[PDB]
């Protein structure tokens, strides 16, 4: 799916 | 295209943006690059204007992101109250 995502 | 420095000061909550991609896990259909996704409002790195969204990742500090797993990326990020970003656009 296209959600994967890490905030810095 | 076009390469450029910028150097962020961590904010209270980190760095203000968040990245998706890697050799681990491609945000683009065969392409490993790590993007910026999001700039958040309020945060340290919108405060400086100068990231804009889908920036490419090119180093964090001295090491460079461009064949790299996403978490090799994010614990350069994570880890450092002041960061070197060499950025692609």
């Known amino acids: 799916n296209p959600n994967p995502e890490t905030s810095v | 295209s076009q390469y450029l420095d910028i150097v962020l000061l961590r904010g209270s909550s980190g760095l203000g943006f968040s990245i998706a991609g890697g050799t681990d896990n491609p945000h683009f259909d065969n392409d490993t690059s790590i993007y910026i996704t999001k700039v958040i409002p309020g945060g340290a790195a919108e405060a400086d204007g100068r990231l804009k ?17 996403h978490q090799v990326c994010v614990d350069a990020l994570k880890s450092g109250s002041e960061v070197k970003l060499r950025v692609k656009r």
Not at chain 2, 56 to 66: N, R
């Open chain 2, 53 to 69: 969204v889908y920036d490419t990742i090119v180093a964090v500090d001295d090491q460079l992101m461009e064949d790299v797993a």
